[PDB]
Every structure is written in C-alpha cells, then in structure tokens.
C-alpha cells in the first residue's frame, strides 16, 4: 500500500531520523516529510494465503454455466445459488469450494 505526496506525487522513502529516534517518510523530489504511524517498513512472507477470496464478483450468479447446489445460505436461506473453488493457480491450492449466495455472496466452506 505504498503512497506518494499530495503535491509532488512521488513515492515516500522511509529515512531514519537519527536525532529524534523517530521514523519519517520523506520523498526526494520535494522536502515534504510526515510522521511514521507504524514502525513497519517492509513485510515479506513465504506462507501466503492471500488471493483466495480476492476473486469475488457480483455478476457471478446470473451466469448459467456456474453450477447449482443444494447447500443452505446462512443469510438468504435460499435453495438456488452457485459455488466455486479458489482461483489460486499455485500448486498448493486446495479443493475447498467457496460456496457463494445470491444475496450476500458470503464465501464459506462446507468442511
């Protein structure tokens, strides 16, 4: 979620403030610097589970090709809705089909 300045539009580089022992966020094409609300700088992981639910759309239901199921909807309690599995192309993707309703479209698992 990297951001820029509101008058220079260049990205903010976190440069340490040696004197005050505070983290700042200073650009380079301008002298506009602000406070650092959170000491986080860079965050990287190897066990990633992001993107499973990022494939949610509202036009899913109308599509006829989407299968039709008999599971119960905790929100609408309807008996005509579809379901789908995660859109992760990683080789470690599972078969936990993300059941979806036609009113709330909540992703919940029947495990």
């Amino acid at each position: 979620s990297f951001r820029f300045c509101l008058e220079c539009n260049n990205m903010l580089y976190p440069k340490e403030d040696k004197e005050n022992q505070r983290l700042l966020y200073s650009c380079r094409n301008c002298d506009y610097t602000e406070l650092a609300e959170d000491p986080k700088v860079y965050r990287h992981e190897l066990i990633t589970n992001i993107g499973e639910t990022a494939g949610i759309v509202d036009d899913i239901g109308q599509d006829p090709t989407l299968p039709r199921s008999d599971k119960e909807c905790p929100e609408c309690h309807s008996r005509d809705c579809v379901f789908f599995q995660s859109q992760q192309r990683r080789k470690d993707t599972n078969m936990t089909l993300f059941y979806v309703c036609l009113n709330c479209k909540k992703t919940f698992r029947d495990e």
Binding site: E16, L23, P39, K40, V41, R43, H44, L46, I47
Partner: protein
C-alpha cells in the same frame, strides 16, 4: 530423474522409528521452509519494542542501529521436522 536408493542398517532396516529418525536427519530442510513471515519493524529503542506481538515476551526475556529484522515461523513445520525454534 535424480534418485538415490539408500540402504539402511540391518537393525534400522527392520526398525521403522530409527528409519524415520535417519530420514529426518538426511532430509535437507532449510530455514526457508520453516519461516512463515518476515517483517521489518523500525524499533528506535534497543531496550524494548513498540509491538505487542512479542512486547511481553521480549521484555520478560530482557530481565546500535535501531533497525529490527523480525521474522515469523510456522509451528507445524518445526514440530513435523522435530527441530525446535
């Protein structure tokens, strides 16, 4: 298709548990496997931390540049490979 056929010791060849131990020994699991997350928190104070995930733990353990390299691990991997943190 690189593949090895490793014969175990006569005792271990009939011993399932020692076979498991030997395999675990040979298996080349590196720290990359065990790691779960890596986050760089800027901790200005070397004496303590401003993060609640380990503030209590690091403080209880206690009793330079301030950049801190903080990484997370997956309990399942360490316990399955039997090596502790």
């Amino acid at each position: 298709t690189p593949a090895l056929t490793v014969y175990l010791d006569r005792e271990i060849a009939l011993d399932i548990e020692k076979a498991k131990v030997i395999q675990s020994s040979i298996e080349y699991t590196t720290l990359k496997n065990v790691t779960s997350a890596t986050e760089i928190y800027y901790d200005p104070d070397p004496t303590s931390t401003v993060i609640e995930e380990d503030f209590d733990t690091v403080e209880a353990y206690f009793s330079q540049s301030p950049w801190l390299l903080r990484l997370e691990l997956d309990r399942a991997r360490m316990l399955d490979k039997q090596l502790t943190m």
